[PDB]
Amino acid sequence: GNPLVYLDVDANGKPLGRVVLELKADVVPKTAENFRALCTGEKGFGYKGSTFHRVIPSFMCQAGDFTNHNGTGGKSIYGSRFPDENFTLKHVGPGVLSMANAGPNTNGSQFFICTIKTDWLDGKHVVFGHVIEGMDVVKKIESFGSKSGRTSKKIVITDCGQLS
Numbered sequence: 291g292n293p294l295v296y297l298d299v300d301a302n303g304k305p306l307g308r309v310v311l312e313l314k315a316d317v318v319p320k321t322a323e324n325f326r327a328l329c330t331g332e333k334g335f336g337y338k339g340s341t342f343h344r345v346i347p348s349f350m351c352q353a354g355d356f357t358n359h360n361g362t363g364g365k366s367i368y369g370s371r372f373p374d375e376n377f378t379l380k381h382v383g384p385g386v387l388s389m390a391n392a393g394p395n396t397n398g399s400q401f402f403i404c405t406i407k408t409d410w411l412d413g414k415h416v417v418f419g420h421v422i423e424g425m426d427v428v429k430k431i432e433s434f435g436s437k438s439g440r441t442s443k444k445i446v447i448t449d450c451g452q453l454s
């Protein structure tokens with residue numbers, strides 16, 4: 291079946307717990323595979339040690355810029371960017387996992403987890419999974435954001451990987 295992956299997240303060096311994500315490889319296999327491999331680190335790079343750099347309460351928590359740590363960088367397992375696979379899955383509510391981008395066909399490694407239904411992103415950001423476990427951890431991360439997106443604590447993916 292679809293992969294299950296995890297992110298273990300700290301805030302100011304204290305563990306918050308684990309977010310477990312189902313990757314919908316049945317719908318978006320290329321996008322799911324990228325995220326899966328960036329969690330395991332098996333290509334020699336990935337999410338371990340990187341941050342949630344933009345967090346906006348009542349919107350989303352964004353992470354995955356493991357090269358510049360500020361929303362300008364990241365890279366995929368395929369190359370620096372890859373196309374929008376499809377827009378079949380929608381931003382239906384809290385817990386949706388979706389790709390950040392800089393316009394059409396600019397997926398890399400940055401991603402976000404929604405904390406509300408974000409329907410205006412449908413057709414613009416590729417949804418590729420959802421939170422299975424750890425929404426409490428996501429709500430803690432969210433609480434450390436601000437309207438500008440600047441975080442009030444240093445939020446780090448200390449470990450990540452594949453469960454199945």
Ligand SMILES: CSCC[C@H](NC(=O)NCc1ccc(N)cc1)C(=O)N1CCC[C@@H]1c1ccccc1SC
Nearest residue numbers: 350352361362363390391392396397398399400402
């Ligand atoms: C269209 S305005 C830019 C959209 C923004 N983009 C980035 O943060 N882009 C930088 C970026 C993302 C991925 C790659 N590979 C390279 C650069 C982005 O992907 N997202 C995902 C949810 C949070 C943010 C966003 C989207 C729509 C409206 C507002 C916002 S943040 C105020």
